[PDB]
Amino acid sequence: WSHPQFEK
Amino acid sequence: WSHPQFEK
Amino acid sequence: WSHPQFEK
Amino acid sequence: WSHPQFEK
Amino acid sequence: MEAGITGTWYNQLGSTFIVTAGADGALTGTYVTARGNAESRYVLTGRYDSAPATDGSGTALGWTVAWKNNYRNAHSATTWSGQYVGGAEARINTQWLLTSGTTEYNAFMSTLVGHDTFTKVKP
Amino acid sequence: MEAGITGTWYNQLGSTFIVTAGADGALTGTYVTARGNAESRYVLTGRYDSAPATDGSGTALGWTVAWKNNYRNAHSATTWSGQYVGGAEARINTQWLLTSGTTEYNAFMSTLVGHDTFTKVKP
Amino acid sequence: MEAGITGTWYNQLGSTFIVTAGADGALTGTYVTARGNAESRYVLTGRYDSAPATDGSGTALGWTVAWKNNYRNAHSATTWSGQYVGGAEARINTQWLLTSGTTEYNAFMSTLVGHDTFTKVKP
Amino acid sequence: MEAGITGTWYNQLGSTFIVTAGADGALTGTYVTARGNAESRYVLTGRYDSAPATDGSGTALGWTVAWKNNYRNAHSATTWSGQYVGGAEARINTQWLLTSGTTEYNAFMSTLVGHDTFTKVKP
Ligand SMILES: [N]
Ligand SMILES: [N]
Ligand SMILES: [N]
Ligand SMILES: [N]
């Protein structure tokens, strides 16, 4: 779903 | 969550 | 050393 | 050819 | 003559690999997940070195399964890249990449990597 | 209907990917290295998702080239695992694994990894 | 003397890499995700070749970020493996592996792979 | 409190991993290749999740070895990305990337990939 490495 | 390659 | 995938 | 990570 | 790749291979987690190696370098056949029912069966296609080195350790090959059949669609594809090694301990050593179509490519859960060892008998 | 994958794709380093996506999920065609002569042409086979998500980012696919033709044999195979993304900036985003047959598998230079972006026009 | 690695590097997607290369081969510093607030800051440690080849293309290095700080914990770690290339187009070319702790290792979403190019100025 | 990572780990091919996991998420210690002499010893640094999920399968970590010591320099760096799993069958499951500095990055032998399982006792 979500992970800080790929955050916008 | 789920994917056929890893199904038990 | 060499391989076709990387040839110039 | 050779590299310490794979040495016998 | 005589690739030793044709036949049934088992990974260490219950999955099955049924392949024919054609004279020409073609791999064709069926990947069956551990569930081992009709829903679990997927087409595989790939290539192998039909003329490996005589000194060498093994026969380079690779194949692809797109995770879509008549029953279900996981909108993804795995490629296995590896080497067949013959002898009484026959093996296909692989590393794999699983890409999902749906996922924005430079986001979380785009491409997974792992490894699989295939043997002629189950563990 | 209408995969947008069929045709000619170019990576960023001079290589060419000529593929037909069949109704059924088959990929077939020819990989041409940057040298772009007869010696540089290799069979490719793979699979793709013939029914991608309508919301989704893209179409999962993969293919294999065994680096053997009528002219030469590098005793190796590369698999590309990736996703087709359509639109006026059409792309195939991939990661690849190159395995050499000859190399003892758990030694130096067994399996290489990298990435390739394919576009409808050269850089 | 003079590694050219010390300083601030930017990937192509908004993330920041602040590192000091010590005389000894140590990499230390801070990885900042694209959100670029306090919550987005993570410790990084790694190593580099403090005596690269004079002919060579570049300086081998790697580093790890465990995705835990004072604010949040994604129970995961990424490693970047790559090479620094100097000149007016200075670059760190990397491939990365993201492993999640929580995930049964030989299941879905255990280890992700991708690539990042770092430059001295943002895109 | 009590990571279970601190100590000596053995891979399946004769290599040794001596690490201390600090309160803070630091990994430090020494990687010893299978030759197991002074020349075979390299610094390792990395990170781990100092607060893993209580439900979870494991503890995410990674580390880097730059293949340079007082004796020799292979102008390269390996990163291991993985997960510690505790219990009487304690394990560190990893995948690794080996990058060479010297090699033009988008050429042959730039980045290798493989996997290593570490256990508390040799095979
Ligand atoms: N972002
Ligand atoms: N299974
Ligand atoms: N080329
Ligand atoms: N060894």
CB pairs under 8 A between A and E: 8
Residues in chain E: 123
Facing residues of E16 across strands? Answer: E10, E32
Residue G10: which H helix or E strand, with range? strand G7-10
B6 three-state secondary structure: helix
In this structure, are residues E8 and E16 in contact, taking their beta carbons and an 8 Å threshold?
Answer: yes
Tokens coding E57: 């350790």
Instruction: Round the CA-based radius of gyration of chain B to a whole number and report it.
Output: 5
Ligand sitting nearest the alpha carbon of H35:
4
Chains with 3 or more CB pairs closer than 8 angstroms to D?
Answer: F, H
F39 three-state secondary structure: helix
Parallel/antiparallel/unpaired status of strands E73-85 and F16-21: unpaired
Three-state secondary structure of chain E: CCCCCCEEEECCCCCEEEEEECCCCEEEEEEECCCCCHHHEEEEEEEECCCCCCCCCCEEEEEEEEEECCCCEEEEEEEEEEEEECCCCCEEEEEEEEEECCCCCCCCCCEEEEEEEEECCCC
**H75-94: b (≥16 Cβ within 10 Å) or e:** bbbbbbbbbbbeeeebbbbb
Contacts of E49 (CB under 8 A, 6+ apart): E25, E59, E60, E61, F66, F67, F68, F73, F75, F76, F77, F101
In this structure, are residues H101 and G53 in contact, taking their beta carbons and an 8 Å threshold?
Answer: yes
Rounded Cα gap, residues F66 and H113, in angstroms: 19
In this structure, are residues H95 and G97 in contact, taking their beta carbons and an 8 Å threshold?
Answer: yes
Parallel/antiparallel/unpaired status of strands G16-21 and G7-10: antiparallel
H23 three-state secondary structure: coil
F19 three-state secondary structure: strand
Distance (angstroms) between ligand 4 centre and the Cα of H16 equals: 11
Compute the Cα dihedral for G101, G103, G105, G108 and give only its sign: negative
How many other β-carbons are positioned within 10 Å of the β-carbon of residue G35?
14
In this structure, are residues H65 and H43 in contact, taking their beta carbons and an 8 Å threshold?
Answer: yes
Residues in chain G: 123
Chains with 3 or more CB pairs closer than 8 angstroms to F?
Answer: C, D, E, G, H
Facing residues of E27 across strands? Answer: E21, E46
Q: What's the Cα-to-Cα distance from H7 to each of F44, G76, H44, rounded to whole Å?
A: 48, 21, 13
DSSP state of H73: E
In this structure, are residues E88 and F73 in contact, taking their beta carbons and an 8 Å threshold?
Answer: no
Residues in chain D: 8
Tokens coding F85: 């993304």
Contacts E74 to B, Cβ<8 Å = 3-5
Contacts of H65 (CB under 8 A, 6+ apart): D5, G47, G62, H31, H42, H43, H44, H77, H78
Rounded Cα gap, residues H13 and H120, in angstroms: 14
Experimental resolution (Å): 2.1
Distance (angstroms) between ligand 1 centre and the Cα of H123 equals: 46
CB pairs under 8 A between E and H: 10
Min Cα separation D8/chain F (Å): 10
Rounded Cα gap, residues G94 and G110, in angstroms: 20
Contacts of G2 (CB under 8 A, 6+ apart): none
Tokens coding A7: 């955050």
Compute the Cα dihedral for E63, E68, E74, E75 and give only its sign: positive
Rounded Cα gap, residues H97 and H79, in angstroms: 5
Rounded Cα gap, residues F7 and F17, in angstroms: 8
What values do phi and psi take at G42, rounded to 5? Answer: -135, 145
Residues in chain B: 8
Token pair 């916008």 is at which residue? A8
F33 lines ligand 3 (CB under 6 A): no
Residue H64: which H helix or E strand, with range? strand H59-68
Tokens coding F57: 């980012």
Contacts G108 to B, Cβ<8 Å = 1-3, 5-6
DSSP state of E47: E
Rounded Cα gap, residues F92 and F96, in angstroms: 12
Ligand sitting nearest the alpha carbon of B4:
2
Experimental method of this PDB entry: X-ray
Min Cα separation F117/chain C (Å): 14
Rounded Cα gap, residues G36 and F111, in angstroms: 36
Rounded Cα gap, residues A2 and B8, in angstroms: 25
In this structure, are residues G50 and H74 in contact, taking their beta carbons and an 8 Å threshold?
Answer: no
Q: Where are the domains of chain F?
A: 1-123
Distance (angstroms) between ligand 2 centre and the Cα of E19 equals: 21
Facing residues of H48 across strands? Answer: H61
Give the type of residue at G111: T
